[PDB]
């Protein structure tokens, strides 16, 4: 009957291997889950017995072949494979000689040191369970297990690399029942995977010195081209952080050549040329990347990809979609002063997002990145730096067309803090206005500045009494972002008052803005220019001494770029007079 069970195990391993080597995306996983059911049913048939010693190394071969084909298809381990390991281990214990896997392993390895000839299958089981613990971030007890396997006198070796290398596979896997993967093949995977993981952690935590060791070790041995790519990129990151640019570039070129997916490298290229200040090249690389991300197989085997973590935001391997980047290009294009280029880029962003009913979902910039309306604002602040002001008004029309419902009906205006107005509506009027100043029409400017100042002051944006929907965490609630929208609106309006020649009104809004935000300095410049025109001496000096008494946190972009836009060049020149 073990003849017949081994005939089945052998059969289903050959079926799974046929499926791995050959086939197409469905018929692959169809045959694979047929084989998974076969190995499930055989496991249940063998677990029906009160285990024999000669039934044990077939049952453990089947347990290993079941966990392999489970985790290769799920593309992820779980705790049911740990319980399966527990079942097999307790089954090894109840033949000859309980609590949990760690001490169960301890006792099982003492039982294997009695030398039953199934150590070929025990070491394979250790490989799979270790893979479980590695994917589950269980690195402390893994050291303890492999420490118990090898000499306990190697106890001081906490580092897994050396310990895993010493951990030998016990056989060349002599004519026993078939396996899908051998313990040495799993050892290679363990090494590269753990080395990679430690390297990434060391990179993120600010030892891109110790990174290089682990990562070169990741290269030397089993390293699939896809990992080769990401490792080198890590290397680019490390050298880039140290200061050493040319070694970094070297690895990056290699990353490019070897890779079919060279998004991640050029982001690194961008951060590199940005670290130096090679702005032109920065933009050129990003420009390529975006076209790059325009463009786009699972083995029934444990590959390394499985065991690597899907990356974080701190990683140098985090590479968004076209949309998330093209926003980066436009941001980086806008903070230099290539308003023209910037404009176009923002329009292309916005074309994608909004036209997109038919194609693939191209998505918004992600919510540690900016909210969908902060982004129509950055689009408009570019369209102003350009001087495309009749585009900068199809923007501020587009926005408040869609978002009518969301707005306050503003009948507190009639009934003359409490009712709620999200910063981006109060802005939208602020840049709807600047548009009219570039079209030169004092009236309808001083309209929109005044309406922006009503939806700052007869409304509060910090009303999370009802978290009523999805909402702007960061950009549109900062007290800094509020006092810096206010100072700005009063500036934009106080200069219209100087242009219509009502310089008392202008003085009042400028005096208010210094009361609002004493760390903008543009406010003090405009106020002091008005005072130096009319009545300098005592007033001006009183504010001089205040500036010298006085002597960026998180203001969003569209707004800093707007502040940057209006501010005059000849500002400190005025403040040392």
């Amino acid at each position: 009957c073990l003849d017949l069970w081994r005939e089945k195990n052998d059969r289903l391993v050959r079926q799974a291997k046929v499926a791995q080597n050959s086939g197409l995306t469905l018929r692959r996983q169809q045959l694979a889950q047929d084989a998974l059911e076969g190995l499930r049913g055989l496991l249940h048939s063998l677990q029906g017995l009160p285990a024999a010693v000669p039934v044990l190394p077939l049952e453990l071969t089947v347990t290993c072949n079941f966990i392999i084909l489970r985790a290769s298809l799920a593309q992820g381990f779980t705790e049911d494979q740990a319980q399966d390991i527990q079942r097999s281990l307790e089954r090894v214990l109840e033949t000859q000689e309980e609590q949990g896997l760690r001490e169960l392993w301890d006792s099982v390895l003492r039982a294997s040191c009695l030398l039953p000839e199934l150590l070929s299958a025990l070491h394979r089981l250790v490989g799979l369970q270790a893979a479980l613990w590695l994917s589950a971030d269980r690195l402390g007890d893994l050291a303890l297990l492999l420490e118990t396997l090898n000499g306990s006198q190697s106890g001081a070796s906490k580092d897994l690399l050396l310990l895993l290398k010493t951990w030998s596979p016990p056989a060349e896997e002599l004519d026993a029942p078939l396996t899908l993967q051998d313990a040495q093949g799993l050892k290679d995977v363990l090494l590269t995977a753990f080395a990679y993981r430690q390297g990434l952690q060391e990179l993120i935590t600010g030892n891109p010195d110790k990174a290089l060791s682990s990562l070169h070790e990741a290269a030397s041995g089993l390293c699939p081209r896809p990992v080769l790519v990401q490792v080198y990129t890590a290397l680019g990151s490390c050298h880039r952080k140290m200061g050493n640019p040319q070694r970094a570039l070297l690895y990056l070129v290699a990353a490019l050549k070897e890779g079919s997916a060279w998004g991640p490298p050029l982001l690194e290229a961008s951060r590199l040329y940005q670290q130096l200040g090679d702005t032109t090249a920065e933009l050129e690389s990003l420009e390529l990347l975006v076209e790059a991300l325009n463009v786009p197989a699972p083995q029934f085997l444990i590959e390394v990809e499985l065991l690597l973590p899907p990356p974080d935001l701190a990683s140098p391997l985090h590479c968004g979609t076209q949309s998330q980047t093209k926003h980066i290009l436009a941001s980086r294009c806008l903070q230099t002063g290539r308003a023209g280029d910037a404009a176009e880029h923002y329009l292309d962003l916005l074309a994608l997002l909004l036209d997109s009913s038919e194609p693939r979902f191209s998505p918004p910039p992600s919510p540690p990145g900016p909210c969908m309306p902060e982004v129509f604002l950055e689009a408009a602040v570019a369209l102003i730096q350009a001087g495309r002001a009749q585009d900068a008004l199809t923007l501020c029309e587009e926005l408040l067309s869609r978002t009518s419902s969301l707005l306050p009906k503003m009948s507190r205006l009639w009934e003359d803090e409490l009712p709620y107005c999200p910063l981006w509506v109060s802005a939208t009027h602020l840049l709807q206005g600047q548009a009219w100043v570039q079209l030169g029409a004092q009236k309808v400017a001083i309209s929109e500045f005044s309406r922006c100042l009503e939806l700052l002051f007869r409304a509060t944006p910090e009303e999370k009494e009802q978290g009523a929907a999805f909402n702007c965490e960061q950009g549109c609630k900062s007290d800094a972002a509020l006092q810096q929208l206010r100072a700005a609106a009063l500036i934009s309006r106080g200069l219209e008052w100087v242009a219509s020649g009502q310089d008392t009104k202008a003085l009042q809004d400028f005096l208010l803005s210094v009361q609002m935000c004493p760390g903008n300095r543009d406010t003090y410049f405009h106020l002091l220019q008005t005072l130096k025109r009319l009545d300098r001496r005592d007033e001006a000096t009183a504010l001089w001494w205040r500036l010298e008494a006085q002597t960026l946190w998180s203001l969003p972009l569209y707004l800093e770029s707007y502040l940057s836009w209006i501010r005059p060049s000849d500002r400190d020149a005025f403040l040392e007079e």
Binding site: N244, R247, L250
Partner: protein, 32 residues
């Protein structure tokens, strides 16, 4: 150079471009 196997391949790249035997470029760069 002022920052191993990489650097050898870099000199190979320069040699493939300029049509000089790599030894001369290596020596000249080292001496400079």
């Amino acid at each position: 150079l002022l920052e191993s196997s990489f650097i050898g391949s870099a000199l190979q790249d320069q040699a493939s471009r300029l049509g000089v035997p790599v030894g001369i470029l290596s020596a000249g760069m080292v001496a400079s």
